Amino acid sequence: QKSYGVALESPTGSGKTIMALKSALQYSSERKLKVLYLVRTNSQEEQVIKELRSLSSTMKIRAIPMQGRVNMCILYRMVDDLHEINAESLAKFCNMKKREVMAGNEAACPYFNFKIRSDETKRFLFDELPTAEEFYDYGERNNVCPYESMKAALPDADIVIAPYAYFLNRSVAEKFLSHWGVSRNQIVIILDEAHNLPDIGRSIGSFRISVESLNRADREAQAYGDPELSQKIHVSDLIEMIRSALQSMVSERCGKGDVRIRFQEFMEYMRIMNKRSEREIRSLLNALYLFGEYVENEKEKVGKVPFSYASSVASRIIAFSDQDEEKYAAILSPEDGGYMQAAALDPSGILEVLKESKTIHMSGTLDPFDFYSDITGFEIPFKKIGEIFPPENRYIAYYDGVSSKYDTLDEKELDRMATVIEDIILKVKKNTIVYFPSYSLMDRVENRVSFEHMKEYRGIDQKELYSMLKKFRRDHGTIFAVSGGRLSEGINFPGNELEMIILAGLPFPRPDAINRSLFDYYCRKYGKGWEYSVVYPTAIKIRQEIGRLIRSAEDTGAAVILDKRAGQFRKFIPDMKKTSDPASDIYNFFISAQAR
DNA sequence: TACG
Ligand code: SF4
Ligand code: NA
Ligand code: NA
Numbered sequence: 285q286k287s288y289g290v291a292l293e294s295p296t297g298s299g300k301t302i303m304a305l306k307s308a309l310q311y312s313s314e315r316k317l318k319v320l321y322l323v324r325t326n327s328q329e330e331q332v333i334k335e336l337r338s339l340s341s342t343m344k345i346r347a348i349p350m351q352g353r354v355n356m357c358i359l360y361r362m363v364d365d366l367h368e369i370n371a372e373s374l375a376k377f378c379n380m381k382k383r384e385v386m387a388g389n390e391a392a393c394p395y396f397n398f399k400i401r402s403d404e405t406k407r408f409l410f411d412e413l414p415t416a417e418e419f420y421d422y423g424e425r426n427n428v429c430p431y432e433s434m435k436a437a438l439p440d441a442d443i444v445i446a447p448y449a450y451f452l453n454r455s456v457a458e459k460f461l462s463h464w465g466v467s468r469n470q471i472v473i474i475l476d477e478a479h480n481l482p483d484i485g486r487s488i489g490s491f492r493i494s495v496e497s498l499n500r501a502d503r504e505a506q507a508y509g510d511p512e513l514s515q516k517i518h519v520s521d522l523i524e525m526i527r528s529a530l531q532s533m534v535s536e537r538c539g540k541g542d543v544r545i546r547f548q549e550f551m552e553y554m555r556i557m558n559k560r561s562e563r564e565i566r567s568l569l570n571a572l573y574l575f576g577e578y579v580e581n582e583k584e585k586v587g588k589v590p591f592s593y594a595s596s597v598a599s600r601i602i603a604f605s606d607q608d609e610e611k612y613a614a615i616l617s618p619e620d621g622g623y624m625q626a627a628a629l630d631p632s633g634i635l636e637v638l639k640e641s642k643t644i645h646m647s648g649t650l651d652p653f654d655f656y657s658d659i660t661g662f663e664i665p666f667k668k669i670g671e672i673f674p675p676e677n678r679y680i681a682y683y684d685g686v687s688s689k690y691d692t693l694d695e696k697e698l699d700r701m702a703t704v705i706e707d708i709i710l711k712v713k714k715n716t717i718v719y720f721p722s723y724s725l726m727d728r729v730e731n732r733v734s735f736e737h738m739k740e741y742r743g744i745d746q747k748e749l750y751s752m753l754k755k756f757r758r759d760h761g762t763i764f765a766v767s768g769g770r771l772s773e774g775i776n777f778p779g780n781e782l783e784m785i786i787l788a789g790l791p792f793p794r795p796d797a798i799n800r801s802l803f804d805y806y807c808r809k810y811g812k813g814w815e816y817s818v819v820y821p822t823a824i825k826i827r828q829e830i831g832r833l834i835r836s837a838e839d840t841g842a843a844v845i846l847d848k849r850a851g852q853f854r855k856f857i858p859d860m861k862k863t864s865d866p867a868s869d870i871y872n873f874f875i876s877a878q879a880r
Numbered sequence: 881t882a883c884g
Contacts, residue, residue, distance in 0.1 A: 541884095688883090689882085689883090690882075690883045691883090693883090721883085721884085722883080722884055723884075724883095742884095766884090767884095768884075790882095792882045792883070793882060793883075793884090794882065794883045794884060795881060795882050795883060796882095796883080796884085799881090799882075799883095800881075800882095803881060803882090813881070814881065814882090817881085817882085818881070818882055822882085
């Protein structure tokens with residue numbers, strides 16, 4: 285009634301968060317509106333679903349998970365080994381399988397059967413409220429399609445939990461809404477961990493063309509006849525023109541990592557190297573897309589997933605050649621084998637469709653809200669609901685004797701940082717996560733310390749990570765973690781499982797091509813490149829990490845930032861003190877906390 | 881105008 289949404293800041297899994305949710309479900313039910321809960325990770329899906337299970341004992345909870353065939357089709361990964369995939373190709377795949385089962389070939393998909401609609405399947409979904417992953421597993425266990433089972437339950441569900449990537453895919457969203465029986469103005473969308481929304485928008489809005497993707501198209505060309513596209517140019521010949529253009533661009537234009545270019549430079553290289561006009565190259569690119577259509581048709585008629593690398597490559601290159609420089613940066617990279625990318629700078633375009641529904645923007649760290657509102661384009665009321673935790677139970681401080689600042693980071697600054705970290709841990713003797721801006725800084729600091737610790741290392745798998753986490757809760761001590769990893773957001777350590785956090789430097793972003801573009805974009809639009817591309821994301825990282833510490837009225841903890849430049853984050857963390865020796869001051873804080 |  286007031287606006288098209290509301291932004292609520294308060295810790296996750298909390299009393300006032302559950303309340304806001306309870307208020308949203310009553311408001312929704314009163315106006316015959318269904319509820320859509322969007323989440324970005326399995327971890328956050330589980331937290332949200334746990335919350336809803338508690339509430340099912342008090343109130344009417346008619347809820348399911350919903351994910352797309354990409355995650356929920358059991359068959360296609362058993363039948364194909366594809367490295368790229370989409371909703372569209374799987375719809376064509378599945379429809380063909382379902383035809384074959386209706387015509388008497390039950391083995392075509394053995395997951396497509398009566399159990400899709402059975403009382404037992406409907407009961408597990410509605411009475412048990414599984415995560416998507418748990419329901420996937422239940423599907424395997426019972427030889428029943430998770431996707432089609434979710435789809436069949438959908439019309440009777442008042443509440444759906446789904447990924448951002450699922451709902452923000454327009455064509456998938458239209459079919460979902462259509463099968464749910466509802467328009468966009470007939471729903472309330474809860475945006476879990478909404479501080480991710482800008483990155484979510486930019487991520488969904490961006491696309492790229494890699495050399496490996498071209499290589500995959502090259503092999504596809506061999507396998508399906510490699511026909512003439514025009515006078516003496518076969519499909520493979522065109523892929524070589526595209527691949528060599530991209531390779532030459534990378535060699536000639538990038539040094540260390542990514543570089544910004546103009547979108548039309550790709551077309552320029554194609555034109556000069558192969559001695560053709562723009563029309564001729566565009567005609568060839570269209571011919572490649574048509575060959576893609578043929579590849580789809582061929583795969584489809586033998587029961588394969590009709591996804592074509594030639595099609596995907598063709599449509600992405602054509603899209604790249606026609607992007608407008610205003611909202612998008614053309615990025616050229618040597619990383620991951622070589623690629624060219626349309627990087628979305630402004631996520632408000634992608635997020636705009638969410639205004640057609642009511643949105644509730646939930647997060648522990650939305651402040652400073654002006655920046656969030658400017659970046660997402662959401663002009664909505666902001667409220668700091670939630671517990672005022674007693675300030676005496678928390679100590680937040682920074683120490684200015686060291687810094688992770690790049691151009692002053694030599695071996696002596698590293699020695700200094702390690703010494704301070706070691707002094708704190710050995711004196712305080714509490715359960716600690718040390719957060720590093722990079723694996724590089726972590727490894728170099730790790731090489732200068734003696735104390736035992738666990739480590740969240742680059743490329744660690746799910747089993748090793750849960751094991752280390754369960755070891756931390758049980759055996760206690762110290763974890764070395766990195767800013768972009770899985771301990772920075774999300775995870776809850778109740779009681780004295782987490783008592784201290786040390787930020788070994790500040791996690792300022794890299795001045796890469798995308799970030800240097802964001803700076804220029806926010807300079808032009810607001811005159812505040814520094815604040816919006818550098819200060820803001822850094823502030824949120826810091827607050828998210830500190831937010832791990834106090835999870836209760838009676839919870840006790842210390843956070844210390846080991847960086848000179850931390851004073852400039854006082855505006856966002858007002859209780860932060862300076863300390864000239866954190867070891868004693870944190871030690872003394874715990875003595876006083878223990879005395880009560 | 882920052883440094884995975
Ligand atoms: S029924 Fe399910 S498992 Fe079978 S093809 Fe369709 S989506 Fe895949
Ligand atoms: Na089975
Ligand atoms: Na070739």
